[PDB]
């Protein structure tokens, strides 16, 4: 079924980058897989943990005292993992922005400039996302990106 020719021909195309700036951005997004309903919840759980390990140490730096070498390092990893998980949730639903930015084309503002500001909204959206409500990420994001 799967020939060796196609397996080489696929990577030949994908590896080459088109001249259109719009296309080259569209191609880059297609890499990251879309998120499952429960997968979304995981990241949300992670970011919350990550976003909170940070709030701890933030106020601790101004007051003075700091955690021990075992705690601060364990604390610091949640911070990394959290900020890492953040950058994942954005890259995943990066398609979502492009989906409803295309509708605003031909309005005296560039498509790319529309996606970017749309992305900019997506960033704020993921910060105030709450996984306690059984709502998917796609709904609370849309209202933010619009």
């Amino acid at each position: 079924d799967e020939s060796e020719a196609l397996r080489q021909a696929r990577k030949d195309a994908e590896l080459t980058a088109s001249a259109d700036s719009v296309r080259a951005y569209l191609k880059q997004i297609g890499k990251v897989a879309l998120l499952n309903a429960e997968e979304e919840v995981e990241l949300a759980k992670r970011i919350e943990a990550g976003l909170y390990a940070t709030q701890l140490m933030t106020e601790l730096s101004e007051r003075g005292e700091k955690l021990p070498a075992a705690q601060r390092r364990d604390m610091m990893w949640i911070c990394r993992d959290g900020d890492r998980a953040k950058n994942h949730l954005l890259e995943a639903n990066l398609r979502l922005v492009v989906s409803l930015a295309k509708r605003y084309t031909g309005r005296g503002m560039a498509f790319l400039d529309l996606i970017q500001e749309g992305n900019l909204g997506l960033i704020r959206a993921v910060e105030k996302f709450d996984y306690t409500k059984g709502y998917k990420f796609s709904t609370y994001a849309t209202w933010w990106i619009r």
């Binding site: 060796e4 590896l15 080459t16 980058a17 700036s21 080259a24």
Partner: protein, 195 residues
Amino acid sequence: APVTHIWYFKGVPSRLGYLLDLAPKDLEKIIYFAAYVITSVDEEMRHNELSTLEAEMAVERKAVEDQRDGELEARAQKLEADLAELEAEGAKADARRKVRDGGEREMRQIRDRAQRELDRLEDIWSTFTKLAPKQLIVDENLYRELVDRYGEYFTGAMGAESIQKLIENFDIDAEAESLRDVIRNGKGQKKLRAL
């Protein structure tokens, strides 16, 4: 963030391309973020750990090869065991040819899947060993793999600011004489581009 003056890039002959001995086509994939460019590399540290790194990379290759040979063995075991199980069922001998070819096709895929892994690990090791400034790694995954494996050894950048770095570490005096030597050589085609 820095951005390249279009007049010296797209203007033909590409002044920037001529300065860094870079291809007009390759220069594109850098500046407009379609390919990473190797900016600098700690060759000494690469050398001082070259012996150990090779050993590491080799064990990973073997561990790939070991699983392949064990995975293929188990499949040959069940291929022969099923062709006899369908023999104890007294099925038509031609109906065993569908099960024979089925196994051979499966074993083939296994070997090729394992081979593509080895070939990647080959292209990975090959790339690192011969890594140097002004190299373009247009394939991101190899680069992603490359940064993680030996990120401590080189400086990988991308875009218009990476171009800026190349210009910074650029020795005009050295690159000038290096071209006059090629001019002193009679060879015409390489003297043309060096002129």
